[PDB]
Amino acid sequence: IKEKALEMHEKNKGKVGVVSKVKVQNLDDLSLVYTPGVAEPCLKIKENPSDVYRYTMKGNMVGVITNGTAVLGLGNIGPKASLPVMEGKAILFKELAGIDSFPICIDSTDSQEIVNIVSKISTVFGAINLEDIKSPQCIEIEDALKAKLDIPVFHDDQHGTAIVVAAGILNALKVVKKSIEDVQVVINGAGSAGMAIAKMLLLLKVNNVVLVDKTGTLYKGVANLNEPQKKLVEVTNKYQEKGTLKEVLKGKDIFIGVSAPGIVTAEMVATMAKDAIVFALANPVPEIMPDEAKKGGARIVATGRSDFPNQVNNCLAFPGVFRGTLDAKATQITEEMKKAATYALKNIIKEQDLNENNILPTSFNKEVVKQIALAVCKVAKETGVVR
Amino acid sequence: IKEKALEMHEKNKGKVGVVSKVKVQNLDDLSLVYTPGVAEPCLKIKENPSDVYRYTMKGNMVGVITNGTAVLGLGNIGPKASLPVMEGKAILFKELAGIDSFPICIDSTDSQEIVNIVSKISTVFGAINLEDIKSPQCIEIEDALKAKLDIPVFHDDQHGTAIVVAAGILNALKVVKKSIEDVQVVINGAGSAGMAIAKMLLLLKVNNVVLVDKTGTLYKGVANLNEPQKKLVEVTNKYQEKGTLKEVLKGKDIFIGVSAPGIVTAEMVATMAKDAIVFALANPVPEIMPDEAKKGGARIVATGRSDFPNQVNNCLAFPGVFRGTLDAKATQITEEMKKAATYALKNIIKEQDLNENNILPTSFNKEVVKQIALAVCKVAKETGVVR
Numbered sequence: 001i002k003e004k005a006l007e008m009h010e011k012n013k014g015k016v017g018v019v020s021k022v023k024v025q026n027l028d029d030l031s032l033v034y035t036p037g038v039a040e041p042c043l044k045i046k047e048n049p050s051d052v053y054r055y056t057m058k059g060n061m062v063g064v065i066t067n068g069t070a071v072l073g074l075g076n077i078g079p080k081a082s083l084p085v086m087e088g089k090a091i092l093f094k095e096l097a098g099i100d101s102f103p104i105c106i107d108s109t110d111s112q113e114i115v116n117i118v119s120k121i122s123t124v125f126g127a128i129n130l131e132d133i134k135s136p137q138c139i140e141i142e143d144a145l146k147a148k149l150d151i152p153v154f155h156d157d158q159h160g161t162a163i164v165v166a167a168g169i170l171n172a173l174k175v176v177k178k179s180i181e182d183v184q185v186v187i188n189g190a191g192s193a194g195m196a197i198a199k200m201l202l203l204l205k206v207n208n209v210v211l212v213d214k215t216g217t218l219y220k221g222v223a224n225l226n227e228p229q230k231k232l233v234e235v236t237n238k239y240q241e242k243g244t245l246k247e248v249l250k251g252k253d254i255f256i257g258v259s260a261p262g263i264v265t266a267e268m269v270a271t272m273a274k275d276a277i278v279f280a281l282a283n284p285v286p287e288i289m290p291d292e293a294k295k296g297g298a299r300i301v302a303t304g305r306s307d308f309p310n311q312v313n314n315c316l317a318f319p320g321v322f323r324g325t326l327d328a329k330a331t332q333i334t335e336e337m338k339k340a341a342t343y344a345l346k347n348i349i350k351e352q353d354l355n356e357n358n359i360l361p362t363s364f365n366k367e368v369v370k371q372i373a374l375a376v377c378k379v380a381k382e383t384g385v386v387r
Numbered sequence: 388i389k390e391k392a393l394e395m396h397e398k399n400k401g402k403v404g405v406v407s408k409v410k411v412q413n414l415d416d417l418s419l420v421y422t423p424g425v426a427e428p429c430l431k432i433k434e435n436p437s438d439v440y441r442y443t444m445k446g447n448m449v450g451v452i453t454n455g456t457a458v459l460g461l462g463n464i465g466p467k468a469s470l471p472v473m474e475g476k477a478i479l480f481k482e483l484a485g486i487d488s489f490p491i492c493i494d495s496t497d498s499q500e501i502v503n504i505v506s507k508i509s510t511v512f513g514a515i516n517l518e519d520i521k522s523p524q525c526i527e528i529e530d531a532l533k534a535k536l537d538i539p540v541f542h543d544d545q546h547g548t549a550i551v552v553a554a555g556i557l558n559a560l561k562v563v564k565k566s567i568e569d570v571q572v573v574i575n576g577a578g579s580a581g582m583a584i585a586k587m588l589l590l591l592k593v594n595n596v597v598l599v600d601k602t603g604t605l606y607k608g609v610a611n612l613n614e615p616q617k618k619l620v621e622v623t624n625k626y627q628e629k630g631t632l633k634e635v636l637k638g639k640d641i642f643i644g645v646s647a648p649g650i651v652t653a654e655m656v657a658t659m660a661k662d663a664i665v666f667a668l669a670n671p672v673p674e675i676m677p678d679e680a681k682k683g684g685a686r687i688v689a690t691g692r693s694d695f696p697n698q699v700n701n702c703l704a705f706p707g708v709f710r711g712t713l714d715a716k717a718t719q720i721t722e723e724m725k726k727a728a729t730y731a732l733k734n735i736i737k738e739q740d741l742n743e744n745n746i747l748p749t750s751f752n753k754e755v756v757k758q759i760a761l762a763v764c765k766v767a768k769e770t771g772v773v774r
């Protein structure tokens with residue numbers, strides 16, 4: 001309900017407050033939380049610069065940095081209007097994985113300016129969560145900061161998406177008894193989230209993925225790919241298929257839509273392979289209803305909806321992703337760490353309890369952050385990507 | 388004690404944590420602190436951009452922004468090493484004036500870069516507290532951001548200093564029965580804090596102030612003034628005196644030192660006017676001890692020391708300054724608002740209870756933030772500098 005939301009925000013002027021982690025009411029402790037006390041850790045950090053991580057909030061602090069240019073489904077609406085979302089993201093870090101988070105909203109659509117600016121304010125952050133930025137812009141920024149900064153940088157709306165998606169896919173294949181190295185996938189929308197699902201599947205040795213945009217699939221020599229679309233045309237659609245979604249969906253095991261509402265029909269689901277897997281994650285109106293999906297013959301349907309039986313939820317991955325990432329002092333959130341965050345999530349469900357309505361856990365299950373963290377941590381230490 | 392400080396910081400990995408201002412454990416409230424709830428204030432702010440201030444932390448949030456280039460008496464030691472100080476400053480905003488504060492430490496010594504960068508991250512802050520930056524650099528940045536941003540910007544180490552100083556001066560004059568429009572002041576150190584005390588006194592119609600640096604006083608045609616020193620040479624030292632501190636101190640009513648340790652003697656205090664006022668605020672070793680100050684003949688001595696009878700303390704002004712500033716929705720922290728913050732502070736002491744050891748209140752007295760706020764607020768509304 002609208003009014004219920006608005007009231008909530010108005011109620012306390014925001015969701016995000018700061019507390020003191022130590023106590024101070026007099027002059028004694030004052031000279032320790034401030035001068036001349038504060039001088040002593042400052043000189044420590046000056047001597048050994050890594051000592052930031054023991055006299056400071058840094059190592060439990062994740063920055064939630066944004067642009068405003070892609071806010072939920074509201075798109076480019078600016079830094080002010082995105083603020084409530086960023087505040088909301090911060091307190092979820094806090095409530096789900098006991099993480100201190102703070103929102104920074106940046107007023108610039110220039111990649112290089114945003115890169116530089118975030119890189120210059122990294123002192124206080126133990127990790128960066130990038131949120132609600134425009135594809136393709138979000139990629140170069142993520143990539144630029146990732147090779148620039150010595151702390152973990154992570155675009156949740158694309159990499160966090162793929163973790164839950166790949167989790168739900170792996171679980172769904174066990175159901176219909178198929179293996180992901182044998183199956184032909186179609187992803188509608190070559191934007192941020194489409195892009196990254198493609199990556200996380202190729203990361204999983206998918207047999208073949210085809211990306212489709214609002215104009216047709218993407219193949220070598222397509223008119224106008226953005227720079228990341230181009231790099232992805234190389235790895236995807238091996239058999240070099242061309243044409244519209246209607247034509248291309250024909251014969252596929254998995255449809256994954258992150259694009260639009262109601263662009264897929266029941267007829268279209270009938271053309272897909274037996275035991276079809278349909279993921280209609282467009283929001284709020286998915287590209288097809290599970291009703292019309294099961295009518296076409298879909299064995300499994302996931303959506304981005306809470307009311308519907310199989311919810312792809314972003315709060316499944318990011319709290320546990322950052323938890324182990326921080327818990328490990330990881331300098332980086334690598335691909336293998338993503339890969340490990342997927343399996344851990346897919347394994348909350350026992351394998352004895354898998355259904356066509358039990359491919360993903362509940363988004364609040366405390367055992368999700370715990371296991372995703374342990375696996376994200378376990379590989380960080382192993383691989384070396386650790387302070 | 389050192390170890391006691393270091394332990395304190397280590398104890399909890401920093402002084403600054405974040406809380407949620409609203410509750411959320413399930414899915415119900417989740418869809419209000421996040422999607423689809425957060426959409427509703429976001430669209431409000433998009434429609435009326437001022438609505439930031441009712442669905443968001445902004446209007447109770449002050450940013451503590453720094454460089455590292457002037458940390459206490461540690462000077463240029465970088466963004467990492469300054470972090471504990473900035474964290475300490477944030478929780479004092481919180482504990483003294485119930486204000487949410489967050490530390491941003493900037494890794495750049497380029498004025499224009501720092502201006503731009505802070506201006507670009509202003510979305511989340513209701514006010515800016517600039518902290519621990521190099522004179523003269525701090526001035527152009529303060530000035531640039533002050534004319535650029537629509538929120539209050541405030542360099543505490545200079546303007547906050549002057550408020551307490553001017554407060555202690557006005558109170559001290561009542562003691563020795565002198566008026567500030569008749570008296571001849573000398574300030575040692577034409578750095579940030581010296582500079583700004585000069586301003587706040589000229590703001591008070593001082594008869595004559597003389598600034599002195601590590602090389603001699605400042606007069607028209609002095610070899611190498613920085614740009615702000617130059618502007619101040621015009622308003623100060625009317626009688627155009629030249630020479631060293633020894634020579635120049637001779638005959639003055641007030642000495643105010645913000646420079647060095649032990650550069651003033653008892654002999655030198657004997658040359659000043661009757662009922663001398665001596666302010667040795669250099670830290671930790673003041674430019675003269677009260678013992679040697681009263682030996683020279685000082686009627687009144689203030690220092691920056693807690694053990695000594697008259698402490699100039701920065702935590703006297705800034706919590707109450709920002710309180711009323713925020714309490715008023717001030718768009719600006721103007722000169723008249725500074726002026727009003729001074730008088731309010733000087734008037735915590737009854738005027739029936741003034742001593743040579745009672746010119747300033749206690750730095751924890753809750754009635755200080757309250758009154759400084761009401762006066763800072765009262766003039767904001769009057770003058771118009773208000774949303």
Ligand SMILES: NC(=O)c1ccc[n+]([C@@H]2O[C@H](COP(=O)([O-])OP(=O)(O)OC[C@H]3O[C@@H](n4cnc5c(N)ncnc54)[C@H](O)[C@@H]3O)[C@@H](O)[C@H]2O)c1
Pocket residue numbers: 073135157161164188189190191192193194212213214215257258259260263281282283284303304305312313314
């Ligand atoms: N957990 C989840 O449920 C979850 C996570 C991420 C995204 N999503 C949903 O997926 C959708 C995409 O989100 P995003 O972050 O990738 O946004 P995005 O704008 O980056 O992706 C959209 C892309 O799809 C393409 N597209 C648009 N309309 C199309 C059409 N009719 N046919 C084919 N292609 C089309 C466009 O090229 C665009 O670049 C959103 O509606 C969002 O709600 C859901």
Ligand SMILES: NC(=O)c1ccc[n+]([C@@H]2O[C@H](COP(=O)([O-])OP(=O)(O)OC[C@H]3O[C@@H](n4cnc5c(N)ncnc54)[C@H](O)[C@@H]3O)[C@@H](O)[C@H]2O)c1
Pocket residue numbers: 460522544548551575576577578579580581599600601602644645646647650668669670671690691692699700701
């Ligand atoms: N509330 C307080 O007690 C309070 C507040 C602010 C500053 N201070 C003290 O005052 C001092 C100055 O602080 P600041 O922020 O202005 O630092 P600053 O470096 O900006 O000011 C120092 C300036 O004094 C000049 N100087 C240095 N040594 C000198 C000497 N021997 N003779 C004459 N001039 C000299 C230099 O030109 C320099 O620019 C510090 O030691 C600080 O502890 C105290």
Ligand SMILES: [Mg+2]
Pocket residue numbers: 072131132157
């Ligand atoms: Mg988002």
Ligand SMILES: [Mg+2]
Pocket residue numbers: 459518519544
């Ligand atoms: Mg300071």
